[PDB]
Design a binder for this molecule. Structure first.
Ligand code: A1JH5
Ligand code: A1JH5
Lengths: 114, 121
């Protein structure tokens, strides 16, 4: 099966270029929300870069958990930030995973996950 | 007693205290290692009758809570300050339907009158 992939967040372009080798990458304010929710529902795996705080990214992860999607969150500790306890605490190590990473290992990590 | 859930990114504290003081007049405010925090948060979110979120500061936690609340069909009120100089995320602004999910723009001074107006309907 070729998974439908959803990505949210030049580092993003490196991530999406690697994601493209495993499946199709799907990615008025009300129109944006409705289009976003249609893609989230079609996706087989939801990939989120969670290093920068975002209400949009968090909202997408919450809607994705309720649809029981496979989720992968990517966080850079070298950013100097401490990841939200709600994102870090949502991980179960299987369907919802939170991976700490360094800029240079983007491609090897995505290869290892898929 | 109606159960109210309040969230906001964590100066901001004193504005949050004014919000929670006003919320307390309409019901019990549930929100007054990391896995334990998440599980406790999800138990409160499920018990809530209305979810109140201050969405002026970007937060992954607040956004995650709103997303889980929408999937539970909760009545939701988001409070945003345009005078902060920020542009509210199109996902939060776009999630509003004007009834079950509402996004209200406000100025610091109208906190109490706005919460009175929402809970008097
Ligand atoms: C390289 C690309 C793929 C362009 C990238 O950097 N992305 C990261 C930022 N990003 C998002 O976080 C995101 C999630 N949903 C949406 C939209 C939903 C609906 C509509 Cl109409 C527009 C956008 N955006 C888009 C993908
Ligand atoms: C004055 C108070 C009420 C203290 C305030 O400023 N608050 C606003 C910020 N805030 C939150 O965004 C929030 C949502 N859920 C939680 C927790 C969930 C689980 C556990 Cl174990 C602890 C907290 N926190 C806490 C409440």
């Amino acid at each position: 099966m070729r998974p439908a992939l959803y990505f949210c967040g030049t580092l993003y372009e490196r991530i999406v270029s690697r994601l493209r080798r495993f499946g199709t990458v799907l990615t008025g304010d009300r129109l944006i929300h409705e289009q976003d929710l249609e893609w989230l529902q079609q996706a087989d795996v939801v990939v989120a870069e969670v290093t920068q705080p975002s209400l949009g990214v968090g909202y997408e992860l919450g809607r994705a958990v309720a649809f029981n999607k496979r989720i992968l969150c990517l966080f850079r500790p070298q950013s100097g930030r401490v990841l939200s306890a709600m994102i870090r605490g949502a991980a179960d190590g299987s369907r919802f995973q939170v991976w700490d990473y360094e800029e240079g290992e983007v491609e090897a990590l995505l290869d290892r996950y898929f």
